[PDB]
From a paper:
Here, we investigated SHMT as an antibacterial target using E. faecium and (+)-SHIN-1. DLS measurements indicated that the hydrodynamic radius of efmSHMT was 4.209 nm with an evaluated molecular weight of 97.2 kDa (theoretical monomer molecular weight is 44.7 kDa), suggesting efmSHMT forms a dimer in solution.
We solved the structures of efmSHMT in complex with pyridoxal 5ʹ-phosphate (PLP) and (+)-SHIN-1 in the absence or presence of Ser at 2.28 and 1.90 Å resolutions, respectively, to characterise SHIN-1 binding to efmSHMT. The C4′ carbon in the PLP ring was covalently linked as a Schiff’s base to K226, as previously reported for the huSHMT structure. The solved structure showed that (+)-SHIN-1 binds to the folate-binding site of efmSHMT. The pyrazole moiety forms a hydrogen bond and van der Waals interactions with the main chain of Leu123 and side chain of His122, respectively. The cyano group in (+)-SHIN-1 forms a polar interaction with the main chain of Ser344. The biphenyl moiety in (+)-SHIN-1 forms hydrophobic interactions with Leu117, Leu123, Val129, Pro352 and Phe353.
Residue numbers in the entry:
A (entry chain A): 3 to 411
B (entry chain B): 2 to 412
Write the structure that this text describes.
Amino acid sequence: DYKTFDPDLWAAIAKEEERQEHNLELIASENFVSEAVMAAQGSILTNKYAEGYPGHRYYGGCEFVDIVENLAIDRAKELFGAKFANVQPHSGSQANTAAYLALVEPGDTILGMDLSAGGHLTHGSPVNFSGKTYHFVAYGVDPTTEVIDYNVVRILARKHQPKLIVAGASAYGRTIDFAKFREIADEVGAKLMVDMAHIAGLVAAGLHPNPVPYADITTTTTHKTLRGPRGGMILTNDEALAKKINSAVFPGIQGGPLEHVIAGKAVAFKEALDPAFKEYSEQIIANAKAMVKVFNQAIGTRVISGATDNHLMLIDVRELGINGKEAESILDSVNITVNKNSIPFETLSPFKTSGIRIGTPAITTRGFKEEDAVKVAELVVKALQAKDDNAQLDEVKTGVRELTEKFPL
Amino acid sequence: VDYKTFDPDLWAAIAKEEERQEHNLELIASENFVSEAVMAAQGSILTNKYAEGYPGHRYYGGCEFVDIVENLAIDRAKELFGAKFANVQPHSGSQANTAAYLALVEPGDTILGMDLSAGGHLTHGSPVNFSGKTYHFVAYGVDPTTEVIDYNVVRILARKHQPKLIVAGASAYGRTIDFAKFREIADEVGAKLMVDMAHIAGLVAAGLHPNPVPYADITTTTTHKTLRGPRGGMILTNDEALAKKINSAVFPGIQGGPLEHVIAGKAVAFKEALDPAFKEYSEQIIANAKAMVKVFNQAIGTRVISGATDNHLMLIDVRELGINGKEAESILDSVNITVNKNSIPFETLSPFKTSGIRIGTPAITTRGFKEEDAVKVAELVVKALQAKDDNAQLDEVKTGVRELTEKFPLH
Ligand SMILES: Cc1n[nH]c2c1[C@](c1cc(CO)cc(-c3ccccc3)c1)(C(C)C)C(C#N)=C(N)O2
Ligand SMILES: Cc1n[nH]c2c1[C@](c1cc(CO)cc(-c3ccccc3)c1)(C(C)C)C(C#N)=C(N)O2
Ligand SMILES: *Cc1c(COP(=O)(O)O)cnc(C)c1O
Ligand SMILES: *Cc1c(COP(=O)(O)O)cnc(C)c1O
Ligand SMILES: [Cl-]
Ligand SMILES: [Cl-]
């Protein structure tokens, strides 16, 4: 009825719910938040200014908003064991912005994972505030094993004497050894910052080593594997760091927080304290390993590093005579969403790439099991092997429809 | 109701905040009540979509309809304010301003912006904010007698310090801002001009405040406040080269994925602001503020800074009542009237005590208050502040508050 006033807006939203229903979301950073999370984001909390922190706001009327933000703060400490949590970052990028501000000065040397090797843009890219503001040295993965070579990272750290070492990745499918990063950091006198955005839910479920005890500062998104609303968060065990972090977030780089989103963080965090979330996360990894099995055995789909320990995988497609962007386009046409993705030692443009990235958190949320995940990888290989063959691509589309009807939203 | 059962801690708190918004006089100058449609947009399944990039140039597929939504927001913004280019991805006014600075100046450049005590925002050069830390800000303020911007002083400062950029816009300034005179001072010294219209964006959209968009190299704004949209930011320009620097600065410059469900709420709100009724709304805002200023001007104890308002807000020196801004704020809070303490020009107290309070009418106007009601509000505020904890008087104010909120219930 309010939709009558703005028919064009609500029509697009309606077609988007239809799109999420009928497509397979394999983009590794996506998920489906719960009805309760969306309800919190749709609440009247959007009306409340609340600059400052609970009990220390810059105007009145925050007595009950402070309950919401405290729940989000306190559930983060419960989920991750940190002594201090900040839940105001508007995004993972802002969380990283403020975490740098608390650890280093502009121009300081920072060691962070190369983007082609699987790092995020905020870990040093020159088109990002991180590369522009600080002096980033990249570490990568080994060219044969495509896993992190900690002795090489150690060579780099001693050569470059960074003030800060950053661990964490957006397209790295293997366990990150946080304890080795800490030893390296200690040895050259650098601090350690971990960006666990992609794996935060696996960490919360106890299925990936927890960086919080090792890192000076841990940043994360609240979406992705955590299955929360879009937003960021900052954790630390050092009270002196927590103070810098808090000043960095506000009044440093942000103004008022999105308390309706923070309310959705609180909702999501309690969902993640439930034992059901560990079963969900167990299924994320098992579905990913099952799909990796299919690709390892298929022809043309080289899994980077040959296995996965977490929710995602990188597929090198150069042996199908295509690039990532063509692979992304083929699969999009049969109603399968992935993203083109640079692979270690990428030779092509970052906008063509030599591979695609695939993650299980979204389909696992829809209820897919290993059987169904195996099926998707088979559909993916069939589509990419079918050199522009409409008969075969329609088959794949049929298989995608079967799956989406089997697991509606 | 079922998800509410899984988390009573969370939802009982939100239930309390609903009651509080319904039972309070919200006089915080930057707050409002967004429509049901806006809230419905922020609560949609659009929170699930990653859409890094811009419409037609995302970094992956599946953005067909997210592009309609964001293009609606962009196009409606171009139409509301008459700018050739609009970026609707900033997560906030602070992000909007962060990206605008990156498109205009280099770290360390000299920038002229309004002093915090005088009414400027934190992002206009405060040393505790990225703006003060990253650039060499030189502040202008207001004249101590008239408490309005002295444009000859801006000229004097601009010529002395040769800023690369001049920033106009304010958070606690109740008078018309002469953008033409800023444009002429910038041109004289060869500086760029940035205008931050967050507070007055809705008045500007209604034609009730001079439009900065033709004068400013870049205009930034929030989408909440007088525009009455979701919390968020926006960047406007007419210059195509700046538009590209702006879009690069926002992504991948300082943000990752945008909040597409908030951007949907921006599109909803921009269409509401294009409706002819929004102009009647915005005119009621100003008439209510002027009605309140008249009352405060007649009560001793409540000195209105500069003695008049042209917009939605007023700044009140309370010191002759023997209290500071913090005490006034909490006095008013105890009788269900919510303001914020606020520094006044040439502030003598701590920035966390302050000499004043800031009051605005956008929120009460949104729930239907007229000039008659705006008058009763200011009278209730005067009564509460003069009551010297006389509980009988404070309880009378609570009744007056209850009368107004029951007379104008919320949606
Ligand atoms: C958007 C983003 N932010 N951080 C990322 C991305 C990814 C990405 C994808 C693409 C696809 O054309 C381009 C870029 C890119 C980065 C710098 C300059 C030009 C283009 C980056 C993925 C995770 C979305 C990506 C890859 N590849 C990984 N490694 O990190
Ligand atoms: C939060 C904010 N951001 N931008 C603003 C604010 C205001 C504000 C209020 C307060 C109230 O204790 C303190 C400060 C402050 C900030 C940093 C250092 C010292 C003091 C600022 C208002 C509009 C909320 C303010 C005032 N006064 C105006 N002028 O601009
Ligand atoms: C996704 C991601 C980010 C950025 O989060 P945004 O909300 O898009 O700004 C930062 N770091 C890592 C490791 C990420 O995976
Ligand atoms: C409120 C305001 C801002 C900050 O907007 P946020 O969303 O809180 O970051 C910036 N400039 C002005 C003039 C403002 O009034
Ligand atoms: Cl990502
Ligand atoms: Cl403000």
